[PDB]
Amino acid sequence: TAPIAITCFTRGLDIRKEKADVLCPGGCPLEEFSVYGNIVYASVSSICGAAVHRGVISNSGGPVRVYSLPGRENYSSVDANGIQSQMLSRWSASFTVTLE
């Protein structure tokens, strides 16, 4: 059983399993990161965006680890590592990211 090597442009929309181990090949630069909620990264957030925001990895790529989070509401907006996370109106698909 193996992780999913994602193209570092894959958002939380593609990977919403209970817990999924993911590899982010390449450097994944500050190209497109619009993040939505801190900790509770709503689905639309990039896996890089969420991971580097969460502080899992530096802006370098690498192995990351996604955990499902149920639907949530009453989000916040917070910046981390030069990536902006913004509140949402009740996104019933979120996650929280970690390391392996």
UniProtKB/Swiss-Prot annotation:
PTM field: N-glycosylated. A 50 kDa form is created by proteolytic cleavage.
Glycosylation sites: N74
Tissues expressing the protein: Expressed in inner ear structures; the cochlea and the vestibule.
Clinical condition linked: Deafness, autosomal dominant, 9: A form of non-syndromic hearing loss characterized by onset in the fourth or fifth decade of life and initially involves the high frequencies. Hearing loss is progressive and usually complete by the sixth decade. In addition to cochlear involvement, DFNA9 patients also exhibit a spectrum of vestibular dysfunctions. Penetrance of the vestibular symptoms is often incomplete, and some patients are minimally affected, whereas others suffer from severe balance disturbances and episodes of vertigo. Deafness, autosomal recessive, 110: A form of non-syndromic, sensorineural deafness characterized by prelingual hearing loss. Sensorineural deafness results from damage to the neural receptors of the inner ear, the nerve pathways to the brain, or the area of the brain that receives sound information. DFNB110 affected individuals additionally exhibit mild, age-dependent vestibular dysfunction.
Domain of life according to the entry: Eukaryota
Domain LCCL positions: 2-95
Biological function: Plays a role in the control of cell shape and motility in the trabecular meshwork.
Name of this chain's protein: Cochlin
Gene encoding the protein: COCH
Places the protein is found: Secreted, Extracellular space, Extracellular matrix
Disulphide-bridged cysteine pairs: C8-C24, C28-C48
Listed result of changing V40G: In DFNA9; affects protein deposition to the extracellular matrix
Included range, full protein: 27 to 126 of 550
Self-association and partners: Monomer. May form homodimer. Interacts with type II collagen. Interacts with SLC44A2. Interacts with ANXA2.
Organism: Homo sapiens (Human)
